[PDB]
């Protein structure tokens, strides 16, 4: 069965993804919960908008929750008459239908990879989470005589698998590291800003790689017309038109994606603010820092291990920069809020009839939230300052650092350039919210004029590895730093 | 006064226990609080069952708590007519009376050890928590001419004290490490299971060591009839009858012990679930792992130091095994629960009349508990994987590891064999609850057929150390690994 | 402009303080918030005492908070008739007026230091938090030809700046380390007690350094009459009279300072007890431990770095001393409180009409506080004991240790002598509350008889550094230990 594949790229990608997902049942269950998350968000928002009445809920015999819920018939009648809501529900239904169809198609293709694991590799589905990827790669390459997946090429090699899995991630790394994509901007009051989100990356990959109109013919060969310099201008113009149309589509879909992002951000993070608002101050490796610190021919887990080992030194380093004004404001606000809250709590404990006064419960809640938020900006008063060994420890893991960082380890310029690789979580969320608004502006006005230069890149930096196909040229662009893959 | 003892075993055990309890007043106070804990549990459960009425409490002018409490006379009348409760109270009273009498007898014997510390050793009761056991041992052995506790033997030795204190723990170690006790079982759906609890250990020590019918004549000499192989079968049969009778007694007492265990588990752990349910996921060294990693002639603190030093590497190692399905379920349940709880909290903050709706407070409480529980199964997303150095660091402390562990440090078999030495806290509680049910079945059906082999052990592995008595043979059974006492 | 200063001591102190405060705007904002803190405390306490009525608040249609607030006119009438409150308000107003006038005067003098930073040093106010003090010192000393601040002395030196900033802190260090100040006391039931607070230090510096009647003539020269031994007795008598008058003034002001301290302690710490009572068990370097471990000619940040680096080993060391009785009491109290609270929480969750019973909410709150407090005295059950390497690591940072500490690292005497350098936070607060009561007794009865010896000190241990002035003799008093500045 594993002879007529013709899509070894997708086959190896699935073989890797099924091992990274810890088997088949876990993958199926994750996909099911993703679908259920979307359905639950949509249904819960619609129910909140239509069914509940909020009149007999806000009290304007004890009243139950089911009284505030309208019966099914009148709620359906109120739903089917909104007009501006059924037109959103239709689109959110067709999108979910497309997603469910894609999931149904993916299950029938992942069952075959499950069978390929069970029989061809002799690896049970209960030994996957205990087999490193090197062992699975060795079992793939050494048994390539039985399943005979690739006979055209004389043999199979680990480098062949690395090229098959990472044919487009190498192109993305080379495009980001040669400053061929518009992800640096100058803003008044902020300065340099790196705006790279998931929407922008998805749009770049849709414009350049996927679709029947992209630069790559089938899966592993860019169209031969893109290997001839005699028509640079015409190809650049066609790519510009494609980018313009995709940007127009994004601008049209902007409000739906914005509503979805707002709803998801609320349903996902509006409780962490209440309970533990310090979790949104912890930093994470930005999406640009994942493409800047990535080697060529490096799988996702190989990069994630390095980004994990260098996470605590990076947090320590970014904590070595005291923000004085923020700490002053936090200290004083915490003092005032706690001084009012102590009086409120004492009056509540003495005689509890105070809990019946109107705005006492809300005041206690909001003052507790204020104290908890303010006490999260105050660093540990006894912390050491070693901002020079920390960069050495970090560079020993991430392997990449601009050359003007080793000496001046404590300046204000090094921090403002490391913060683009190691960004806040709140900034991540905030620029995830603004992505559906800014992405069309970036695609229409900023990426479109570069459509010529890109055409040159794919023409000058695409090699032909025998048996694999058209791959990206390796680290000849010595704009980055030390390697050690 | 310290010449006519005749029970040097118990004397040295008390001298060690008074130092391990940080003096005399702390020991007295701990015993008093244990008695008060038992009395409080029983009295509080009886009061909850009988006095309170729960009719005018559940509301079916503001009502006070003392209204729900029945007056003393009617509560006593309701207690003395239950029949199925006074028969439990009588037994719980005679058991507590026996415990209190034992405590009263132990105080009059520990005051003498206090005097022995003050005068014979010249160690004030305020310098005990600052004197290591080596110093107390040296002061015992070097001043053995004044108090002349042991004149029969020519001198006193540290090894003599070690043998006197640990005469039965060595026997327990040798019995557990030679697989002479039934504590490994095969279960459908679980596989290998090590069931070793405090009830089983207490029953083993009662069957073999304590009592006027055990194998040991007075304190330090097993009956001479157990040193002759001419009557192996008769002694095995007598031991089998003894085990059967003790198992029958345990089976009869099963319901009382089960009720006590349920009540104690509720009163002790039902609040940690509410506030911090992650404390019951932290692991601890099981009761079998304390007898498997124990050297011969090793006091309790000498073993506890090693089990403390190797606690954080063991936690790190057991955390290096990601449970994928549990993490998926936890993530999704936390998302859903928090998404509902955020809406509830926002509606509560906006207008607080919502707090009067019937099932809003209970819903908020249960959803908070659900979020807090689910957020305790999600590991740190940035954690390193070094499961090979961790076993080296652990073995450098616990000194014992099966030989097929060093190489294959990340397999599923090594984890399932280390988890029997380092078990969950929730599993500890759960198998503490099932102990009064399973212990009689283990004693009647599993330990009884081995009654012959044990008789051989005590006959072939009991040496006679001069001046000390009948002790267990040392580590000639090379079934374990590296030592270094 | 920077030629006619004549007060280089204050100028260099301000230049250092503006850099330690992270610029000018942060300093201004901190001073403003200090003034606002005082004003807020006074106004809030007066409002609580007078305006609110607590009759219609304790409930003896839903009642609002503004109903309990009396209208402005009747509240002003109730304020202006208290008599025993307006006499406190007048004093708290004149003190705040003096503070505000001092702040207004300090701003007009710190703007000049801001200009001196901007122009003379060419350091923008946005590069201060990224310039170590060594760089600012180098820019001060190397550009001393342009601003020509000090021409009398041939040149300027880093040692000159060190002497100018720390002319009185060296005197305080030498006075504390020669046992010339009464800060050790013998108390029945406690033993040795080191009572050194901020009030005592302020009074010492006011008696000896500041004021027109102190020992120092203008700023940098003690009166020549204090360099002649022909009048030791008369000068000692005059100093004794001065100390007596200052102590009488403190005894008169005692009630106001005591009221202020009580109010500030409540408004600042009465919420940390509720939420996280374990933060008041964490230790901090006492005010005596900051003067005992301080080198000569050592700025505040140079000492704070050492006190920061040696904070975690010191906490570990002070945690290695188990308090047995406290742990027993904490365990048992936590058990009882949690056992009652679990029943209350279960009854609350089952049927919520129980929340309307009178003393259920207060009971739940107080039992939660009790459980949270008791669970803060229980140490980690798996902790290592290495109390000998910890003293080495600590001494490698604090540089000072009595000689009888290295060997006997675990005795009860070493802990009771380290706890005076590393005290609790609760003890700090408690002896901050008792300071206005004990300070006059210490100044009148204990410091006054020493008034002769001090007069000898300033006469025998004051050298004349050329260009700087009268400074304190360096570490010739070899009563302390290893240095390495
Ligand atoms: C686009 C599709 C929209 C779907 C909308 C639903 C999405 C839901 C998803 C999620 C909402 C989660 C809460 C659901 C409410 C459950 C409450 C409950 O127990 O049952 C409720 C019981 O209701 P009842 O008592 O029969 O009604 C009382 C009416 N009465 C006052 C006249 C008697
Ligand atoms: C013109 C042609 C093409 C123009 C279409 C441009 C769409 C741009 C979407 C940008 C975007 O946010 O994509 C993001 C998600 O988005 C998706 O996964 C698909 C979004 C499709 C939105 C269409 C709504 C229904 C249209 C109905 C019209 C009637 C990309 O995020 P990601 O993580 O890269 O994607 C992984 C998907 N996952 C997160 C669900 C696993
Ligand atoms: C409500 C706030 C919810 C979001 C909380 C996190 C926002 C955030 O990124 O905070 C960050 C910045 O924060 C800033 O730079 C400005 C602070 C938040 C702006 C809003 C002010 C309050 C409204 C946190 O600032 P930080 O000093 O890095 O705090 C971490 C320092 N620590 C890890 C030592 C504790
Ligand atoms: O920027 C500054 C701080 O700026 C902040 O830290 C802003 C933080 C406040 C935003 C909080 C949003 C909370 C969204 C959730 C609320 C719940 C959802 C509510 C939904 C309704 C600098 O931050 P940085 O990380 O140094 O800069 C990195 C950015 N860069 C890479 C572009 C340089
Ligand atoms: C086996 C032995 C059984 C012992 C059972 C006791 C175990 C207790 C151990 C523990 C229970 C802990 C709670 C005890 C209740 C105390 C409440 C309180 O303050 O006093 C209570 C006051 O009661 P009262 O107001 O006099 O009664 C009101 C009756 N009336 C409504 C008619 C007026
Ligand atoms: C036939 C002859 C003997 C048969 C008796 C067999 C009893 C088996 C008990 C098993 C058990 O759980 O023991 C456990 C406790 O238990 C005890 O401490 C004593 C329990 C006695 C229960 C009798 C109830 C009253 C009987 C009235 C009849 C009328 C052992 O636990 P442990 O920690 O080893 O013990 C330390 C005790 N401590 C925890 C209190 C410090
Ligand atoms: O087993 C698996 C997990 O299994 C679990 O972890 C089960 C945990 C759920 C039990 C929770 C009980 C809470 C009791 C308190 C509630 C409050 C009291 C309520 C009282 C009414 C494996 O776990 P392990 O540790 O790898 O296996 C060790 C077991 N062995 C040594 C036999 C191999
Ligand atoms: C020494 C100087 C003393 C200064 C004292 C003040 C210090 C304050 C500092 C701090 C107190 C902080 C709380 C202030 C109260 C604010 C409440 C609010 O919103 O306004 C309040 C609104 O009040 P109102 O509704 O106009 O009054 C209702 C009266 N009525 C019932 C007759 C209608
Ligand atoms: C006779 C002559 C002098 C006798 C006066 C002796 C005063 C002793 C005060 C002791 C004291 O607690 O001082 C403390 C504070 O205190 C101050 O800052 C000033 C206190 C003045 C109190 C006068 C009240 C109004 C008198 C009105 C009469 C009509 C010292 O604390 P500190 O931290 O060293 O000071 C820094 C100030 N800071 C904390 C605000 C930054
Ligand atoms: C209410 C209490 C509020 C203050 C809490 C802190 C008081 C305090 O200094 O506790 C301290 C002592 O504490 C003692 O030495 C006695 C304990 C407090 C005395 C009052 C008893 C309860 C009333 C804490 O005692 P500890 O054992 O150092 O606790 C820290 C040990 N740990 C860091 C390992 C957890
Ligand atoms: O002493 C012993 C413990 O003693 C304690 O630890 C006492 C702690 C309880 C005091 C809590 C006060 C809380 C004040 C806030 C409440 C809110 C405000 C409420 C305001 C109304 C020993 O402690 P130590 O640290 O080893 O001894 C150092 C002291 N020495 C240097 C003198 C030796």
Curated annotation (Swiss-Prot), chains A, B, C:
Catalytic activity annotation: a 1,2-diacyl-sn-glycero-3-phosphocholine(in) = a 1,2-diacyl-sn-glycero-3-phosphocholine(out); a 1,2-diacyl-sn-glycero-3-phospho-L-serine(in) = a 1,2-diacyl-sn-glycero-3-phospho-L-serine(out); a 1,2-diacyl-sn-glycero-3-phosphoethanolamine(in) = a 1,2-diacyl-sn-glycero-3-phosphoethanolamine(out)
GO CC annotation: autophagosome; endoplasmic reticulum membrane; endosome; Golgi apparatus; Golgi membrane; intracellular membrane-bounded organelle; late endosome; late endosome membrane
GO terms under biological process: autophagosome assembly; bone morphogenesis; innate immune response; mitophagy; negative regulation of interferon-beta production; negative regulation of macrophage cytokine production; piecemeal microautophagy of the nucleus; programmed necrotic cell death
Subcellular location: Preautophagosomal structure membrane; Cytoplasmic vesicle, Autophagosome membrane; Golgi apparatus, trans-Golgi network membrane; Late endosome membrane
Sequence ranges on the Cytoplasmic membrane side: 108-243, 255-272, 282-324, 378-423, 434-436
GO molecular function: phospholipid scramblase activity
Membrane topology term: Multi-pass membrane protein
Family: Belongs to the ATG9 family.
Domain notes: Forms a homotrimer with a solvated central pore, which is connected laterally to the cytosol through the cavity within each protomer. Acts as a lipid scramblase that uses its central pore to function: the central pore opens laterally to accommodate lipid headgroups, thereby enabling lipid flipping and redistribution of lipids added to the outer leaflet of ATG9A-containing vesicles, thereby enabling growth into autophagosomes. The tyrosine-based sorting signal motif, also named YXX-psi motif, promotes interaction with the AP-4 complex.
Protein name per its UniProtKB record: Autophagy-related protein 9A
Organism: Homo sapiens (Human)
